Design a protein around this ligand. Sequence first.
Ligand SMILES: O=P(O)(O)OC[C@H]1O[C@H](OP(=O)(O)OP(=O)(O)O)[C@H](O)[C@@H]1O
Ligand SMILES: O=P(O)(O)OC[C@H]1O[C@H](OP(=O)(O)OP(=O)(O)O)[C@H](O)[C@@H]1O
Ligand SMILES: O=P(O)(O)OC[C@H]1O[C@H](OP(=O)(O)OP(=O)(O)O)[C@H](O)[C@@H]1O
Ligand SMILES: O=P(O)(O)OC[C@H]1O[C@H](OP(=O)(O)OP(=O)(O)O)[C@H](O)[C@@H]1O
Ligand SMILES: O=P(O)(O)OC[C@H]1O[C@H](OP(=O)(O)OP(=O)(O)O)[C@H](O)[C@@H]1O
Ligand SMILES: O=P(O)(O)OC[C@H]1O[C@H](OP(=O)(O)OP(=O)(O)O)[C@H](O)[C@@H]1O
Ligand SMILES: [Mg+2]
Ligand SMILES: [Mg+2]
Ligand SMILES: [Mg+2]
Ligand SMILES: [Mg+2]
Ligand SMILES: [Mg+2]
Ligand SMILES: [Mg+2]
Ligand SMILES: [Mg+2]
Ligand SMILES: [Mg+2]
Ligand SMILES: [Mg+2]
Ligand SMILES: [Mg+2]
Ligand SMILES: [Mg+2]
Ligand SMILES: [Mg+2]
Lengths: 309, 309, 309, 309, 309, 309
Amino acid sequence: PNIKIFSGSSHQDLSQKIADRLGLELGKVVTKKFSNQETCVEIGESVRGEDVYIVQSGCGEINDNLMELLIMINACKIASASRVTAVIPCFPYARQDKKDKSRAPISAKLVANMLSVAGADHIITMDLHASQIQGFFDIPVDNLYAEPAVLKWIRENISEWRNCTIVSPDAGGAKRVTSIADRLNVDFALIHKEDRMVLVGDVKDRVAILVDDMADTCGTICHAADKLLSAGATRVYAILTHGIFSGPAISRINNACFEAVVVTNTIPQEDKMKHCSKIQVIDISMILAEAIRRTHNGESVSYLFSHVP
Amino acid sequence: PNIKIFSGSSHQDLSQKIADRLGLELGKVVTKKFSNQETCVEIGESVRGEDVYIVQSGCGEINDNLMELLIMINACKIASASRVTAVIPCFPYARQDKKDKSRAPISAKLVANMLSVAGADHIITMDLHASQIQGFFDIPVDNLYAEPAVLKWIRENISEWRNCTIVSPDAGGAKRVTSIADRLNVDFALIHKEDRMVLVGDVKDRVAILVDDMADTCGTICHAADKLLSAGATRVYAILTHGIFSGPAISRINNACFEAVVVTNTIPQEDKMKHCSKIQVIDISMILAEAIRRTHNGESVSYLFSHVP
Amino acid sequence: PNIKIFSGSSHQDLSQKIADRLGLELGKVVTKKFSNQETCVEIGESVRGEDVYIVQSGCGEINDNLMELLIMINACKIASASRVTAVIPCFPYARQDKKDKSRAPISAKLVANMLSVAGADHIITMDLHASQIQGFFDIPVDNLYAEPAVLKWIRENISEWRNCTIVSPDAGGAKRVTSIADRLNVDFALIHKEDRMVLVGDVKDRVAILVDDMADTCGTICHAADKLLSAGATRVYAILTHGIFSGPAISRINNACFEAVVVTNTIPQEDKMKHCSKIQVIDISMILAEAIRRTHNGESVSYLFSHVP
Amino acid sequence: PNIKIFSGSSHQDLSQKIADRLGLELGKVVTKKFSNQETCVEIGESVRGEDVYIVQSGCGEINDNLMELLIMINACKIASASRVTAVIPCFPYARQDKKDKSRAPISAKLVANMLSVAGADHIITMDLHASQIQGFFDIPVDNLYAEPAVLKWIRENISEWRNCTIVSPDAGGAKRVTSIADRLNVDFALIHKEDRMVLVGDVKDRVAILVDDMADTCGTICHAADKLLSAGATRVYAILTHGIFSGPAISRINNACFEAVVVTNTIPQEDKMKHCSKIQVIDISMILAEAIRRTHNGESVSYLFSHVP
Amino acid sequence: PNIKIFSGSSHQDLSQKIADRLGLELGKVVTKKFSNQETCVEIGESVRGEDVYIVQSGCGEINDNLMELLIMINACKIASASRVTAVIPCFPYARQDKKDKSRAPISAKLVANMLSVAGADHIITMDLHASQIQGFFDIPVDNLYAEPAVLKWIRENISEWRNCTIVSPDAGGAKRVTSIADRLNVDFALIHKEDRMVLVGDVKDRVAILVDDMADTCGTICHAADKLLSAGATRVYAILTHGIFSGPAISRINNACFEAVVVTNTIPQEDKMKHCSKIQVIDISMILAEAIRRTHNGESVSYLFSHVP
Amino acid sequence: PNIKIFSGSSHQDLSQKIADRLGLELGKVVTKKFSNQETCVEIGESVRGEDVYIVQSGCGEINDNLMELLIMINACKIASASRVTAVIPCFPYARQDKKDKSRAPISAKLVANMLSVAGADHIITMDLHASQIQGFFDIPVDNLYAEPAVLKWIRENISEWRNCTIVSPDAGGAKRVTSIADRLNVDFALIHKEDRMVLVGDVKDRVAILVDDMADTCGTICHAADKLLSAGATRVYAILTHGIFSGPAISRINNACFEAVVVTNTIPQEDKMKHCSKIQVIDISMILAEAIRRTHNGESVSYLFSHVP
Ligand SMILES: O=P(O)(O)OC[C@H]1O[C@H](OP(=O)(O)OP(=O)(O)O)[C@H](O)[C@@H]1O
Ligand SMILES: O=P(O)(O)OC[C@H]1O[C@H](OP(=O)(O)OP(=O)(O)O)[C@H](O)[C@@H]1O
Ligand SMILES: O=P(O)(O)OC[C@H]1O[C@H](OP(=O)(O)OP(=O)(O)O)[C@H](O)[C@@H]1O
Ligand SMILES: O=P(O)(O)OC[C@H]1O[C@H](OP(=O)(O)OP(=O)(O)O)[C@H](O)[C@@H]1O
Ligand SMILES: O=P(O)(O)OC[C@H]1O[C@H](OP(=O)(O)OP(=O)(O)O)[C@H](O)[C@@H]1O
Ligand SMILES: O=P(O)(O)OC[C@H]1O[C@H](OP(=O)(O)OP(=O)(O)O)[C@H](O)[C@@H]1O
Ligand SMILES: [Mg+2]
Ligand SMILES: [Mg+2]
Ligand SMILES: [Mg+2]
Ligand SMILES: [Mg+2]
Ligand SMILES: [Mg+2]
Ligand SMILES: [Mg+2]
Ligand SMILES: [Mg+2]
Ligand SMILES: [Mg+2]
Ligand SMILES: [Mg+2]
Ligand SMILES: [Mg+2]
Ligand SMILES: [Mg+2]
Ligand SMILES: [Mg+2]
């Protein structure tokens, strides 16, 4: 069985980068819409007995991309692929992970069920919003971390990183920032709202680094940056693995006081970078390519949790 | 257990009509989008131990409506509804029912699987494109027919209906037109392409009635009407249960020679009727309401196959 | 269908209380061990067509209790009970909810799968460690909150509760304490370690109230109380819904500086209260009885989230 | 894919022997208990793409061992092992194979379901109490027989084996003893109770050999030996594949009249042999190692049914 | 929901008797064959929301009857029956319950799986060949016993029944005969082959009663009767719940020395009674009717295990 | 059948509270007067096959409220409600329960007869003036007690309640005060007139608690309080379930020496509390809601006699 890399419509640049780092060409697939807005998927090459990897991120027009992904998975499954893996850098509906005193659907579980019934045997994703989403599946799920690439960017871009601070925008981000701080050996502050917020950890004359999993409307990071500047921090950085940047996000970032908003390219950012000069992008295509290659060859994937390939 | 009728965003008028004919109010549900194009569903009333019916048609923005439908089904299922029924007047992806020498997904089967895994116990639909789609499910599926309402419209709108002709636009429509002709006791012609088409059945000075399940781009009915006028038919009618009317459909119908294009309101048509004066709408909300009420009360549903309620 | 309440061996007092508040007698079941440590379960009364509720908490000898619970569920399922509900006040293996950079099993998902395959149709539990565990099941799960009873105890036991403070022992407890503070209209502090910990929120001359979901070894609450007394708080309270109290817990609580350690009786505490004079117990059997009765009668269960029955 | 052998806590000696006969080292796994009696399993080596075999016998603290086994299976399954096999020399709850006019659970079926849902693809077991338990699974089950090793022991340990007798302790043991007698070409007696028992088959001055699948409380074999000595048999032997030896078993065997109680090491017997001088152990680790190796290499496993490796 | 009783083609007399004892008419169903030997099933009445019971015995042309049964179950399931129960007085392939050192299918498990996937929610059967077959299903299975009717026949037909003997034809029949003997308070003999057989239990001048679950080729009962007459028993009786009577059975019974071969009407016997004057039939339709009625009304079914209705 | 709660004009606040505690909306009913003072009742929703509860208290303009109640009962009865229950917290004409040497009507019996002939199937009332009024009906009557709520108020409002006294204003109130005293374990005094009255029971320096069923003109409680202060009691309390407060009542209470006059909200008191600062109100809407819910669900209602819901 050989690796076949297929791209959805959501993130073609990421898929091309991944295929480049594997020494492959993207699989021949036509993904369009009929006139009635129905997804049309045609696999243009035989995938019989192959190790198929479909790259599709939960971004853009989310329901359309998810439908395309499910249809591609099912097409490869009934075309007798030996194994079908969904490479989903940003997991759709990941924030619908709990009910919490509401008659709300756990939409992430529904997405996991639909991926399972489409025929996915393996999920590769990056920085799941909640790790418990791994339990929503009955198939193996590899949850990669952008932390190696984030630390690399911090070291090569913040000259004052030995005295800097790693700040979480909310309580739920504590573990990630603590890990980052430990690997950098730096002090780590915290922030949480009460319309007011409290920041704990000395930041005066010290660079603050907000680290968080995603920014959708950028209310969280903007409030955090406001408070960080209240406490007299010199410069403020925001680092995110998923730059959804929806709605008022670009205006808020433009009107905010960040020195940089760094995001990983799990979501295409070219358009967002057009209208916001302070957005920078970390390439994580090497981590995804390495994970695909290691799952194919049966090598350890947890090695990546601590090493940049 | 009491009937609860919930509406999706796709066809709110149809749901309101159905709820009216059942003497009920639509269930309290909020269906919106987050900023990142993610479906948000909130059931505003307890459905515990109730007989929930969700009305949503595979029209408009199809993937968005299907995602909303699945999310609503799952929300009602994990909110402890006794039974959840998906009322899907136009089944999405119904035309993806077969592979036919292509590495194509059978998307209708995938939709059936997703409806099953969301937790639907019953499907009510109208004029499935292929009856074999009933076999795609492991739950009961009630496939209603618009034929009663169609015959009623023909009798009350075509004064020459005793001498008229019932014509199929393609080979695959033969059974429906034969049934219509038998119930009307009229001659039935046929049409099939060869860029040329052949029409069999005397139509000169006789009204032709094209009857078909759906019109998406209206190429089929337009070519059929062209040939019918070649054979000297006096007036031409098109009757359809699903008026998708996507892409060039409205321009084609406006430039065509139909005396009327009649569709059933399984899909909202107000906007299409705005730009096409020859589209008429048959109400089928009574058939849907009667089917919902008969499934709830355990009465025979196959009774509707031959009787207008 | 009538309510049948069955008790496991884990918490017989709680089951008797629940049956009392429902006006019922506990179902006739023999639960013993064979000589080879194998669970023997014998339902002594017909459950055919009944609404069976099995009360068993993930406490004591956990694997034995879980096996007994699964065996009872399966026995009632193949004895033709109409519906089987597992009332699990403390969910076993709930802390194994994620992998987090380790080749660790998500044991909570395995427990959910085993409960599903034994034949449980409904789960009633109290204060799940992670709400995402609700997504581990495909059946409905009712996750009750001890917050109503906790607020009642605080108001009737802490005369200074209008000026008091609600403190979380770790970051992951933020939401619960914020809800408690909002319903009491009090200031809410926070605590997190760095061997050192930082406390945010004025507590001098003010009573601190640690609120947390469980205490297993009581390291978390003991460190939190140490820091709270460092910041000069007058008296310190710990409130918990699950008092596992395993290992060095009783000695730590005896050597600690709590004014009271209050727990809810989701786990039997008679033995622990024998060796620790500062443990108090909140009865939550009324919430469980009300939830059982409301699920049986089809009434709203989410009503309990805000009201003491 | 390479063989990985993992040991549970139940029978570490058997697992070490099996790994020795395969030329392997036991896989690196930590299996302990948290303070609250919860099973903790940590796979210390990557099993990605490997052929994992977990050795765990339904002995000792049975529910704890079964939970450990299920947790290990699930851990290896979601760690992307190519195939997971449960090597279960003594199947837990095997005697709960039928209902038989009681509202009793078929606990063996529940255990099979839990093994399936944990993710086991293959079961290797020895001398199932009922062969129909193979039908409880939907995965392949290899049910090895200790008969080759038993015949070897009889021939090398009973000098009078050509004139001896093979006796069943109950009716349900008839097939096994008949097979043993046929392979030895000896007369076979039978025993069954009526507090009295009847023995059929001449045994005077002839050695009797009780052969049975398991001895739990040793009431069956002790009553059989009593009757055999009533009929004037010279010496009495008991041979068993599973020596559970629970409760009053050791005292009964010490007070009985056996010349030897021979058991196979599907269960650890060191402790039991400490307090009973007449217990002897047949090694069956070679049969288990050969079965593991033959399933891995795709060679015939049914070959072992008649040949000692 | 009301009881609907449907008959297959296998045993129409039994179904009519059952419907009579329930005060019902048999449901309107057409069960025929197309020209190509394909089963055609048409439910002639609505079963929507009803409690459907399909009576079909594993007799006659077994594969044809089983296919008809599965097709009827599926037809009633997708016709929206509330609950479908398969009343299978003689379970097909019940003797294929184990592998036993052969690459043989466990066909009984396959039949259980097919019944489950057709949509059966409940199985009612009589005297399963192995009780472990109840574990082959994941749905409830009621395994009725003919013992009440057998004891009634013995008491009303064998005037010497207080001094008689209850004999098992093989080892595997021990439990049934022991139960019969206990309820009659009589001595119980046993028989097993070695071409020779041994009988244990005094039978001289005493009537022997062979009791067994089924007679297929009647080799077992004929050899048992031969040995019983060797031991000087006065008269010999054979009692069976399933009279398959295939192949040389009728000639063997005619040439044998039975005073009577009594069978229960789980299989039609009119044709067999035509060519064998010593076959008598016990009606068990009352037990089946009582079980159907008690499962419908939610009353105890295990009551029948000891009482003739 | 579902619960329908309808409010009369007498006590709309109580009905809204009851509907809130049942999770319902008040039924749509228009209750007005024509110009000629005639009651107009229009049920605005179908009550066919429903469980109708009409809440109306014998207060305010009593004859008008009673006529409205009877008209509503009759309207729901001839609108085919399955069952109609009159929830009458204060029973009108309850004090006309006997003749007693006068040509007086037993008006309470007449009211019971009119309620029966209007079509009421069930009466729920609170603290009937005479229990024998239950015998005036031939339908079931549930006579709830305010004693649980009264004891709760006493314990949470009179800090000296362990040494207090429970005093009856007249002889006819003996049973109620004795029950209250027994549940509180306190001494109970008594009072009865001779223009003079005698008080029995030590009250010096002890709080006296007058407990009585109703206060109409408050002559009884005012004379009792006068005597209690004659005997040197420190503070005096009056507790009543029905605060009619007609005529000179408010002036008498204002000029009296009560520390508090506590009443239950069986009658609206907002207007009376406007002109009397010492009137406090106990909510009993939870008892009424619980009784309605328990009668609907068939649960025990006599449970409430001893427990606050
Ligand atoms: O839309 P934005 O203002 O950019 O906010 C996005 C936030 O949503 C998620 O947090 P969530 O609110 O789910 O809290 P949690 O991380 O504690 O679950 C995530 O951690 C981001 O902080
Ligand atoms: O987009 P339009 O030009 O309006 O055509 C829509 C056609 O699609 C379907 O037919 P299909 O081509 O699937 O053939 P079939 O009915 O024989 O399957 C349907 O019967 C319509 O005739
Ligand atoms: O054994 P103890 O010292 O009593 O600690 C028990 C802790 O375990 C859980 O927290 P966890 O460590 O899982 O963190 P989380 O709540 O943030 O997930 C729980 O919230 C308790 O605080
Ligand atoms: O606890 P002990 O006295 O050692 O008895 C253990 C017995 O249990 C099993 O027989 P079972 O009673 O299940 O009968 P069966 O073999 O006929 O099913 C097994 O065959 C042993 O003989
Ligand atoms: O075809 P016949 O000669 O009439 O034999 C039929 C026999 O088959 C079954 O026994 P089986 O051989 O399966 O043994 P068991 O009952 O011990 O399983 C059954 O108990 C009958 O005795
Ligand atoms: O109008 P008021 O001065 O407030 O009096 C109202 C009194 O009427 C009732 O007593 P009743 O006189 O009927 O005597 P009884 O309770 O002994 O029947 C009731 O018990 C009150 O005590
Ligand atoms: Mg969140
Ligand atoms: Mg967050
Ligand atoms: Mg087609
Ligand atoms: Mg067509
Ligand atoms: Mg945790
Ligand atoms: Mg915590
Ligand atoms: Mg047995
Ligand atoms: Mg045995
Ligand atoms: Mg057999
Ligand atoms: Mg047999
Ligand atoms: Mg009076
Ligand atoms: Mg009075």
